[PDB]
Design a protein around this ligand. Structure first.
Ligand code: HEM
Ligand SMILES: Cc1ccc(OP(=O)(O)O)cc1
Length: 405
């Protein structure tokens, strides 16, 4: 290979290539995707931190250029969205993030803990009633929970879980997938639908108020806060995607990785108090996002390597998280790892994940109830888990499990 084993869209096990890259070419120009690929912890954290030099404005630009058909569909369909927050830059970013944070209050979703817990228990019970004692932590638990949670917060109809998963799959594929022009066409139609619904919900809040995040955002604007209807709709476009896709993945990975480390699953059974540190280590070792993008605003350097104004940068947090310079025996999963929260799976700096607490809350509750109700849980077999191809999102498509009668 010419890129040290790195295959940009191959999500099944990228960590040996990350390791090779850190040692051999820590800042590597990859012409196959058009980015400087960055793999060391210190280089990645410094780049996140320096927002004045490295803009996030390309974080939502498609990795593969939008072809003619998709372009026509989305133009004809009134698609005018780009980024609610992640790819905005100051001063717009600063203004809109502050308004989002003030509506997205911690006390608002922690009041959903009992509903989330009851929901988890219901799914576990339904799974255990299966006619073969075989389950899948993705379809039988992780799929629904964060989705219903974020839909409830935003004020969307919870019967639309399957629709939002289709819209979410399409955003993930369109923007970070290796799609042909023809493959972009169904996703384009879905993105059009998605954006129309975001706008519809802002209009509905204007007309009828409500008790949710959308209505709160409209009430802020009504009280004089500077945020337009297009910006509120864009915050919905953001939250109705970012607010569940990666948490579904996280919950899935919690079971995938822990069930593969029986000694540590057993520790969790024995002491449920270890679960939050366990989630920290799953986030380091198996974060939902392994790479995120930046754009150089001027000639600069990363790790001593010259980067041109306008060059794209792919920061591989999945690699940062294994860097021996920051994490001793970094390739090993260890729930007791004291500095696991130094991980960069939520980013760092001005765009740092808005919903990180909500995501950890749901992972914790899932682990608490599943370990309580099915301590004998284990993987169906080895080599039974595949990952969808994507530049940035590392998504196990299933986690087949079984248990004792
Ligand atoms: C479940 C695991 C999650 C992971 C691994 C994750 C990861 C990330 C990452 C890597 C970023 C970009 C960080 C940066 O550019 O510095 C980000 C930003 C963001 N995330 Fe999360 N996220 C998760 C869950 C959530 C949830 C549950 C929500 C909403 C409830 C959320 C909402 C957002 C928003 C709105 C931004 C943009 C913030 C900004 O640009 O100021 N995320 N997240
Ligand atoms: C990780 C992430 C964060 C925000 C997103 O949505 P926008 O804020 O619309 O860019 C998408 C993915």
């Amino acid at each position: 290979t010419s890129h040290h084993g790195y295959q940009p869209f191959d999500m099944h096990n990228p960590f040996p290539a990350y390791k090779e890259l850190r040692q051999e070419e820590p800042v590597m120009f990859d012409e196959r995707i058009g980015y400087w690929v960055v793999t060391k912890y210190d280089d990645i954290k410094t780049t996140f931190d320096d927002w004045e030099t490295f803009s996030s404005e390309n974080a939502q630009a498609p990795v593969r250029k939008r072809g003619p058909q998709a372009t026509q569909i989305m133009t004809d369909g009134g698609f005018t969205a780009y980024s609610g927050l992640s790819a905005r830059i100051p001063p717009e970013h600063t203004r809109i993030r502050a308004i989002a944070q003030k509506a997205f209050t911690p006390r608002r979703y922690k009041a959903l803990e009992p509903d989330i817990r009851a929901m988890v228990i219901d799914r576990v019970e339904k799974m255990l009633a299966n006619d073969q004692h075989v389950g899948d932590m993705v379809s039988d638990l992780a799929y629904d929970i964060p989705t219903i949670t974020i839909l409830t917060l935003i004020g969307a109809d919870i019967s639309m879980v399957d629709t939002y998963k289709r819209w979410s799959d399409s955003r993930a594929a369109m923007t970070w997938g290796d799609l042909s022009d023809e493959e972009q066409i169904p996703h384009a139609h879905n993105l059009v639908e998605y954006w129309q619904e975001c706008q519809r919900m802002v209009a509905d809040a204007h007309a009828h108020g409500g008790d949710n995040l959308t209505a709160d955002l409209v009430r802020a604007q009504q009280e004089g806060q500077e945020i337009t209807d297009h910006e509120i709709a864009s915050l919905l476009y953001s939250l109705l995607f970012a607010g569940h896709e990666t948490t579904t993945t996280l919950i899935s990975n919690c079971f995938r990785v822990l069930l593969d480390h029986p000694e540590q699953w057993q520790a969790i059974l024995e002491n449920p108090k270890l679960i939050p540190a366990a989630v920290d280590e799953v986030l380091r070792y198996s974060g939902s996002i392994v790479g995120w993008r930046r754009k150089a605003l001027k000639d600069t350097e990363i790790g001593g390597v010259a980067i041109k104004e306008g060059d794209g940068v792919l920061l591989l947090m999945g690699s940062a998280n294994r860097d021996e310079a920051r994490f001793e025996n970094g390739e090993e999963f260890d729930i007791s790892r004291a500095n696991a929260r130094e991980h960069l799976s939520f980013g760092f700096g001005i765009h740092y994940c808005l919903g990180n607490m909500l995501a950890k809350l749901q992972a914790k509750i899932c682990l608490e109830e599943v370990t309580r109700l099915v301590p004998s849980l284990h993987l169906v077999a080895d080599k039974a888990i595949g990952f969808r191809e994507n530049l940035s999102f590392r998504v196990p498509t299933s986690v087949p499990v079984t248990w004792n009668a």
